[PDB]
Amino acid sequence: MNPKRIRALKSGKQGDGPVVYWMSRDQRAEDNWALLFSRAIAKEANVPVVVVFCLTDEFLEAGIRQYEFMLKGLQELEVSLSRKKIPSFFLRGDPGEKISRFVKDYNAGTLVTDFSPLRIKNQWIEKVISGISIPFFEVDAHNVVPCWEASQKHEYAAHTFRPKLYALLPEFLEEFPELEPNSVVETLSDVLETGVKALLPERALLKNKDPLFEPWHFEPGEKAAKKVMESFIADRLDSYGALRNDPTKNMLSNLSPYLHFGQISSQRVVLEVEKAESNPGSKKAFLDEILIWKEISDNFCYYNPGYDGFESFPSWAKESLNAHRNDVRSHIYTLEEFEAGKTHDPLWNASQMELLSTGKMHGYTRMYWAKKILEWSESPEKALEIAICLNDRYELDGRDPNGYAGIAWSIGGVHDRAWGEREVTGKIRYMSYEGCKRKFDVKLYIEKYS
Ligand SMILES: Cc1cc2nc3c(=O)[nH]c(=O)nc-3n(C[C@H](O)[C@H](O)[C@H](O)COP(=O)(O)OP(=O)(O)OC[C@H]3O[C@@H](n4cnc5c(N)ncnc54)[C@H](O)[C@@H]3O)c2cc1C
């Protein structure tokens, strides 16, 4: 119940109507600070709380793989909120007009949203504040430590962000109090039915018109996310430290699609892992990625308006890449050639098949995949657009602060340091095909994804 997690977007005349939780990033009912804080305000004013989700016109920028995963979880979400006497309303259109109309139509008293540092979220908020007079609060329900409290500036390395985040852990790492039930807009299936129809022409296929995506790797919903966490801790947490860099072994947690859509709280994952009596070396490696690297991605996007642009790169990286702009590239590939996996690197290729077929590329190959796009592009800016385009289109965890921070790490050296000076790539960290062969059995990875 710590009120540091709450930030006031606008202070207006407090209405006497239902507290509206505008759910965007954290699509879950358990372990949701935004959902709990909305219920707290509802109790204090003796008024019910409601949940509103907006289905924006931007779903056509992505594929069916992301659309189905989000909506199937929401269908489970609606029934979960119903058993807590909480009605969920699902609107279709721009949030700027849809939230404003819903606020006036339903006589909203307090408006609550979850925190997301992405530009598109800031786009909606600007419109919403321009059409309401009721108070507007936001809650960081995605980070263990609130983004504005962990640091008040951009952090240039994990070395600097780790002590600030770990010092605030004894305060913000706590259990979740129960969501007490409330005291006392057509359908979901049809929206998903018409959404798939509008996206079907853009489906990814491989020659024979057979769909490339395989939807049986990660089931959606809050329930499935919990089982994945239980599976990871019981079976793969011990070997996470020593096998996380091997793409031939499914040793990863596989929590990112649930983490991105907010189907499971990262704080819940950290709480359970801390209780687990596993390999302390593997535990330290795991908490680094879900706490340091995950929450520094929000820090990167929150304190850099141009997080997806060349301007956000460190100065040493910008000048190093600028000094190698005119170096002749060994090869140049178009976006269509990158998309289809038609490069001269069978290792880079096979990473694309895993991305296209499963929607989740291995973490280690994600670094190789992004850095080779820089090596084989006309300019670093062109590689930035290609990497963002492919990641957001085909990753189930894409369109996330982790994605923009991860690409910025691979291409622009964000949260990194200078390495040996090479041509084309400059001082950016370089990952070689020969180097990967010495780290894992590349042939097994290639044969898996042909
Ligand atoms: C170029 C690039 C693109 C990426 N695209 C995305 C993205 O769009 N969305 C996304 O959520 N992840 C992205 N990843 C980050 C990371 O690769 C994934 O989080 C991870 O691979 C997801 O699979 P996992 O949960 O089984 O990994 P795990 O080893 O199980 O890690 C668990 C969690 O820690 C976090 N995490 C792990 N590695 C990183 C990292 N390098 N940076 C930040 N957080 C991390 C993730 O939340 C992850 O879910 C990207 C990284 C890079 C370098």
From TrEMBL:
Catalytic activity: cyclobutadipyrimidine (in DNA) = 2 pyrimidine residues (in DNA)
Keyword Nucleotide-binding recorded: yes
Record-listed FAD 1 binding positions: 240, 253-256, 289, 360, 366, 391, 397, 402
Residues annotated to bind FAD 2: 240, 253-254, 256, 360, 391, 397, 402
Keywords associated with the record: Chromophore, DNA damage, DNA repair, DNA-binding, FAD, Flavoprotein, Lyase, Nucleotide-binding
InterPro entries linked: Crypto/Photolyase_FAD-like_sf (IPR036134), Crypto/Photolyase_N_sf (IPR036155), DNA_photolyase_2 (IPR008148), DNA_photolyase_N (IPR006050), Photolyase_Class-2 (IPR052219), Rossmann-like_a/b/a_fold (IPR014729)
Cofactor: coenzyme F420-(gamma-Glu)n; FAD
Enzyme class, broadest EC rank: lyase
EC number: 4.1.99.3
Keyword DNA damage recorded: yes
GO molecular function, a single term: deoxyribodipyrimidine photo-lyase activity
One of the GO BP terms on file: photoreactive repair
Entries under Gene3D superfamilies matching the protein: 1.25.40.80, DNA Cyclobutane Dipyrimidine Photolyase, subunit A, domain 3, HUPs
Domain Photolyase/cryptochrome alpha/beta: 17-147
UniProt similarity note: Belongs to the DNA photolyase class-2 family.
Protein name: Deoxyribodipyrimidine photo-lyase
Originating species: Methanosarcina mazei (strain ATCC BAA-159 / DSM 3647 / Goe1 / Go1 / JCM 11833 / OCM 88) (Methanosarcina frisia)
Phylogenetic classification of the source organism: Archaea, Methanobacteriati, Methanobacteriota, Stenosarchaea group, Methanomicrobia
